[PDB]
Design a protein around this ligand. Structure first.
Ligand code: ADP
Ligand code: CL
Ligand code: MG
Ligand code: MG
Lengths: 296, 257
């Protein structure tokens, strides 16, 4: 760690800290993710083991590059390429003006390409949210923070119930399905898409039930017709209020027909009918996609 | 996930070649032997049962072990340390609830200390360079199972049993890729339970014809026939359970197609 100059703390967690740093010898600017092992009587945390092993396989323009791993007795350092900022900070800075539609389309298109690459390499992200998405000055956006990621099997089996951040969490998880898969990542991206368009979180719940109801009030309460098997889910209650589906013209006003079409398919209740990353990329919404530069 | 199924299979077929251990590594180990490796793996089977770990976790641990031994000389007194750290790492990778290190220490009856197991975890990680996401016979099996409609749980239990038996005997199974071992196991299991043969749909997807499975299939058939006589018995005991349809009690076929 002699060769790294810490420039500033850009993130923090329970496992450690994230720094912006520069290589003293080459000048390279990097992101340094520090993970404590001393506070670890369990050795190397499973979260780190998964993040590192899965990132090493994921070589794609829209996935953050892991440059190095430094493993010592007391500490573990992950070295990443440095990007200007995360999508949350960008959205906050754009909260008044709005992100131009051509840029929103470019970001979604890129996110879908990164996600499709993940899924094609049997990796679930499970923590897609704006703060885990990184943008550079040239118009690129990349998936990051694979600390909750997991390699999955075909067919899948029961994985960890407590995963995605509440606001971005899919209804099959909220309702406690024994099985979830790639569709949970698409749901998260759907929420992020709408968030970019409207400048605010689509479903900002403050509890699991509140989260569920916010979804129900917008997309309508699911039934056996819209979602076969739903009334048999572990945390489904027949006493749920029955709300009607809202018109997307009200949910995402700025969005054209194709945008509304794609968004609704990304937020389909039934995981088996929900659009895949691959299919999403072929949606007419993207027929005119360009790569505009953001405004920083 | 039918949209990615094909891509994933293709990817796994590329990875299994990269994560493949060195076929003849035991000749170059000065102190340990195939018989000692068999004893280790048989013991890992029991450990997995004790802690109700996934079969996938077991398969990963074996992969880690064989790759580690492919480049590191290990004395017989330390082989179980390598095995324990491997199971710990596989648990952390694969399980929702990995056992804590103190439990791994306990399961070895204090043969090693916590410090030793943690230090061995570090060494294994370094030697494998954190490349832990290996394809296993298990992963290919579950994909192959999808070609059964409706599903046949007995055929699945038997296939898993046969696949697990292959972990014990480095000679000869180290020379076959997981995808190929999984194909022979699936065919043999299907043939035994239903008298049917490896599907045309699987021949197309995998590129393996029934003839290309033959070499591995002949070995697997012998292993199956002689299973009750093998020195290691933890897998048979495991698969006598009703949750596995007591498939280890089924009589293997005398001859093949
Ligand atoms: N490669 C990077 N370039 C720029 N900023 C980063 C990078 N990696 C992380 N960050 C910043 O640090 C924050 C936390 O990093 P992350 O990898 O998400 O760790 P955690 O698991 O603690 O969330 C991110 O929200 C982001 O703002
Ligand atoms: Cl966020
Ligand atoms: Mg994060
Ligand atoms: Mg994280």
């Amino acid at each position: 760690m002699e060769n790294f100059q810490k420039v500033e703390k850009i993130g923090e967690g329970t496992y450690g800290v994230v720094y912006k740093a520069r290589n003293k010898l080459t000048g390279e600017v990097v992101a340094l993710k520090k993970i404590r092992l001393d506070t670890e009587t369990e050795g190397v945390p499973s979260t780190a083991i998964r993040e590192i092993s899965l990132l090493k396989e994921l070589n794609h323009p829209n996935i953050v590059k892991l440059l190095d791993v430094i493993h010592t007795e007391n500490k573990l350092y992950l070295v990443f390429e440095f990007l200007h900022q995360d999508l949350k900070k960008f959205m906050d800075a754009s909260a008044l003006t709005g992100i131009p539609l051509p840029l929103i389309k470019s970001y979604l298109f890129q996110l879908l390409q990164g996600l499709a690459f993940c899924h094609s390499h049997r990796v679930l992200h499970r923590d897609l949210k704006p703060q885990n998405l990184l943008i550079n000055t040239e118009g690129a956006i990349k998936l990051a923070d694979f600390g909750l990621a997991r390699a999955f099997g075909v067919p899948v089996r029961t994985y960890t119930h407590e995963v995605v951040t509440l606001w971005y969490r899919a209804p099959e998880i909220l309702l406690g399905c024994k099985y979830y898969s790639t569709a949970v990542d698409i749901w998260s991206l759907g929420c992020i898409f709408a968030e970019m368009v409207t400048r605010r979180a689509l479903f900002p719940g403050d509890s699991e039930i509140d989260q569920l109801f916010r979804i129900f009030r917008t997309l309508g309460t699911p039934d056996e017709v819209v979602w076969p098997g739903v009334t048999s889910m572990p945390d489904y209650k027949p006493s749920f209020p029955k709300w009607a589906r809202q018109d997307f013209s009200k949910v995402v006003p700025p969005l054209d027909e194709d945008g509304r079409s794609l968004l609704s398919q990304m937020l389909h209740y039934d995981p088996n009918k929900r659009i895949s990353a691959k299919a999403a990329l072929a949606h007419p919404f993207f027929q005119d996609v360009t790569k505009p530069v953001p405004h920083l | 996930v039918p949209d990615y199924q094909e891509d994933i299979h293709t990817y796994l077929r590329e990875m299994e070649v990269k994560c493949k251990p060195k076929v003849g590594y035991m000749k170059r180990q000065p102190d340990i032997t195939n018989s000692m490796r068999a004893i280790l793996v048989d013991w890992l089977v029991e450990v997995g049962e004790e802690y109700k770990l996934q079969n996938e976790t077991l398969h990963l641990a074996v992969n880690y072990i064989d790759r580690f031994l492919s480049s590191m000389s290990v004395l017989r007194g330390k082989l179980q340390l390598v095995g324990t750290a491997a199971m710990l790492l596989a648990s952390k990778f694969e399980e929702i609830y990995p056992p804590e290190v103190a439990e791994f220490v306990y399961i070895t009856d204090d043969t090693y200390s916590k410090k030793q197991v943690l230090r061995m975890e570090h060494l294994v990680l370094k030697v494998l360079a954190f490349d832990l996401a290996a394809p296993t016979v298990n992963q290919f099996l579950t994909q192959y199972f999808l070609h059964l409609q409706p599903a046949n749980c007995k055929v699945e239990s038997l296939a898993m049993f046969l696949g697990e038996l292959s972990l014990i005997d480095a000679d000869p199974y180290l020379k076959y890729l997981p995808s190929l071992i999984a194909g022979a196991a699936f065919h043999l299991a299907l043939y035994t339970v239903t008298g049917q043969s490896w599907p045309e749909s699987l021949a197309q997807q995998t590129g393996y014809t029934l003839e290309s499975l033959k070499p591995c299939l002949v070995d697997l058939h012998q292993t199956y026939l002689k299973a009750p006589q093998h020195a290691q018995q933890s897998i048979r005991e495991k698969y006598k359970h009703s949750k596995y349809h007591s498939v280890s009690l089924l009589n293997p076929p005398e001859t093949l197609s």
